[PDB]
Amino acid sequence: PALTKSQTDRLEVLLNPKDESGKPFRELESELLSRRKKDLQQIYAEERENYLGKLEREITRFFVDRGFLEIKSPILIPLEYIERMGIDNDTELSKQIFRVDKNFCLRPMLAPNLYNYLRKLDRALPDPIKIFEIGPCYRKESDGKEHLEEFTMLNFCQMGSGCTRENLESIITDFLNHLGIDFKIVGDGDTLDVMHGDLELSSAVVGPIPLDREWGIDKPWIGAGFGLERLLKVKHDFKNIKRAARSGSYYNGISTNL
Amino acid sequence: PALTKSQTDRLEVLLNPKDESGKPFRELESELLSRRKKDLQQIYAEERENYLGKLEREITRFFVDRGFLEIKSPILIPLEYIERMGIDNDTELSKQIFRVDKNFCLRPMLAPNLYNYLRKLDRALPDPIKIFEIGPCYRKESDGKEHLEEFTMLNFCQMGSGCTRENLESIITDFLNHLGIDFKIVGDGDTLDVMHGDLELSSAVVGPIPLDREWGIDKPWIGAGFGLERLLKVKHDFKNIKRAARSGSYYNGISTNL
Ligand SMILES: Nc1ncnc2c1ncn2[C@@H]1O[C@H](COP(=O)(O)OP(=O)(O)NP(=O)(O)O)[C@@H](O)[C@H]1O
Ligand SMILES: Nc1ncnc2c1ncn2[C@@H]1O[C@H](COP(=O)(O)OP(=O)(O)NP(=O)(O)O)[C@@H](O)[C@H]1O
Ligand SMILES: [Mg+2]
Numbered sequence: 253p254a255l256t257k258s259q260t261d262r263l264e265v266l267l268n269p270k271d272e273s274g275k276p277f278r279e280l281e282s283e284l285l286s287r288r289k290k291d292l293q294q295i296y297a298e299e300r301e302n303y304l305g306k307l308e309r310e311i312t313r314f315f316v317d318r319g320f321l322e323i324k325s326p327i328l329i330p331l332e333y334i335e336r337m338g339i340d341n342d343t344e345l346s347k348q349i350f351r352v353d354k355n356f357c358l359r360p361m362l363a364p365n366l367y368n369y370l371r372k373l374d375r376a377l378p379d380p381i382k383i384f385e386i387g388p389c390y391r392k393e394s395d396g397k398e399h400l401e402e403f404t405m406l407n408f409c410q411m412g413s414g415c416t417r418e419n420l421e422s423i424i425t426d427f428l429n430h431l432g433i434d435f436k437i438v439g440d441g442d443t444l445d446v447m448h449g450d451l452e453l454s455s456a457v458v459g460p461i462p463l464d465r466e467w468g469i470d471k472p473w474i475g476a477g478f479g480l481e482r483l484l485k486v487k488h489d490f491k492n493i494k495r496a497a498r499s500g501s502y503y504n505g506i507s508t509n510l
Numbered sequence: 511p512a513l514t515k516s517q518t519d520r521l522e523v524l525l526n527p528k529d530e531s532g533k534p535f536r537e538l539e540s541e542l543l544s545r546r547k548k549d550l551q552q553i554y555a556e557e558r559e560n561y562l563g564k565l566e567r568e569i570t571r572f573f574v575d576r577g578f579l580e581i582k583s584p585i586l587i588p589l590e591y592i593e594r595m596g597i598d599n600d601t602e603l604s605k606q607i608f609r610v611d612k613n614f615c616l617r618p619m620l621a622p623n624l625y626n627y628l629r630k631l632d633r634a635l636p637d638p639i640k641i642f643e644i645g646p647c648y649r650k651e652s653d654g655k656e657h658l659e660e661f662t663m664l665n666f667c668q669m670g671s672g673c674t675r676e677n678l679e680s681i682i683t684d685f686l687n688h689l690g691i692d693f694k695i696v697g698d699g700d701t702l703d704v705m706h707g708d709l710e711l712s713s714a715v716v717g718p719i720p721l722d723r724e725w726g727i728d729k730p731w732i733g734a735g736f737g738l739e740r741l742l743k744v745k746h747d748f749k750n751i752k753r754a755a756r757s758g759s760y761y762n763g764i765s766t767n768l
């Protein structure tokens with residue numbers, strides 16, 4: 253008769269964005285199951301590349317080509333960096349942190365080590381210094397429609413000449429027109445927000461900023477952080493952020509429970 | 511006069527593999543410091559790519575081209591997977607584990623999720639099933655000349671037809687001749703060891719294996735795990751594994767303390 257809520261939830265899991273009443277649950281399920289099996293078969297026959305990995309690689313050629321240096325820093329950082337990042341029980345990120353042992357934790361962001369790389373590289377590189385990093389980041393979350401506790405972050409930045417907000421926005425714009433993601437910047441050192449509809453695609457800043465001193469920076473800098481899973485959720489039009497996440501439940505948005 | 515042990519340790523840090531008595535410490539230090547600064551400047555002027563990332567990308571094109579499916583699974587896995595992997599206080603890996611909260615931990619290896627992917631994909635993919643994954647792995651270690659507590663693992667495998675040890679060795683051999691790494695396999699289901707001199711480059715297995723059942727496998731399979739940092743330490747001839755690790759201390763083997 254009418255599909256139950258549970259059968260609906262099930263059919264949605266097998267339902268891809270691009271898909272388009274009458275038959276019972278058993279057949280509708282069977283129709284989707286063969287469709288999904290066919291998609292996986294096609295992926296395996298030709299492409300064989302994972303979305304996350306593919307994006308990370310396209311994002312990387314993008315910044316490397318535009319002159320940024322590719323950084324791969326630790327994911328398991330000293331807990332101290334969280335304090336030194338100006339994150340006390342004052343902010344939300346306070347408990348959002350996955351503590352490992354007593355002296356470590358899971359980098360909830362890329363800033364700490366990108367700061368370190370800027371201080372150190374200034375002693376050897378011409379102006380301006382341009383660097384980026386793409387990688388695993390962690391934050392405990394209560395929601396789960398746009399938040400994953402384990403996700404991938406892209407953080408790029410420049411220090412020295414050219415660190416103007418006109419330029420920061422120009423990188424943000426070339427970037428996203430390259431990926432093919434509609435966006436809107438919103439602001440008023442500075443703090444911008446790159447939004448996709450009601451979804452935060454990125455928060456960027458134009459420094460210097462007071463914190464800069466705690467890391468030994470002291471120069472003008474520009475920069476921004478984007479979530480790879482969110483860029484994916486937009487590009488592929490997935491209803492839930494889970495379809496673009498590292499998972500044992502979906503591959504390139506296709507359910508693995510067939 | 512004679513260099514102290516400390517000055518020596520310092521000069522070694524600035525010393526690259528390819529470099530080749532007389533002057534005092536101050537000048538020798540100054541000579542190396544400009545050399546390193548020049549290398550970083552060259553990297554930044556032309557390449558701009560990180561070793562780890564670059565390797566991961568070359569390894570990836572390799573397996574994808576040879577028909578393997580690229581997997582990106584979670585790094586923060588359920589603690590249960592460690593028990594189900596047959597790791598009790600019986601083995602060394604018992605305490606080598608970084609526990610996160612009470613139900614999680616840091617994947618000390620790729621097996622758990624590759625097993626899951628094999629069970630699930632069998633329901634949709636032709637024979638044989640070929641998949642791989644490259645990514646962060648964690649184990650507490652006492653040593654540190656060939657062991658990093660945070661490192662990168664490459665795990666590839668096949669299930670079904672063709673899972674012969676003659677084939678496993680053939681993949682291992684094409685792989686390494688492609689990267690340009692001298693090696694030697696040593697064995698006698700099976701367990702092989704790919705060594706570089708006295709260094710373990712990889713441990714491989716030819717299943718089925720008894721464990722296979724706990725993950726719902728039940729088919730013949732072949733496979734192996736390599737450390738990206740170790741492959742790097744060999745290719746670039748770094749004296750210590752720290753030079754190829756994710757770090758705030760070295761970039762492509764060049765010290766960042768200039
Ligand atoms: N849990 C998450 N899952 C996916 N992406 C995230 C997550 N947390 C942050 N990001 C991304 O990181 C960039 C923003 O960083 P940040 O300013 O730390 O987020 P926030 O301010 O925590 N945003 P929000 O969680 O929506 O209130 C954007 O690309 C976000 O999509
Ligand atoms: N801590 C580590 N640092 C770098 N590579 C590692 C580390 N642990 C394992 N590997 C790599 O993973 C592959 C072997 O996996 P595994 O069999 O778990 O190592 P093991 O048996 O722990 N070897 P070992 O630590 O030398 O006694 C090889 O490529 C190793 O170089
Ligand atoms: Mg938040």
Ligand SMILES: [Mg+2]
Pocket residue numbers: 452454455
């Ligand atoms: Mg924000």
Ligand SMILES: [Mg+2]
Pocket residue numbers: 602
């Ligand atoms: Mg060991």
Ligand SMILES: [Mg+2]
Pocket residue numbers: 710712713
């Ligand atoms: Mg071994």
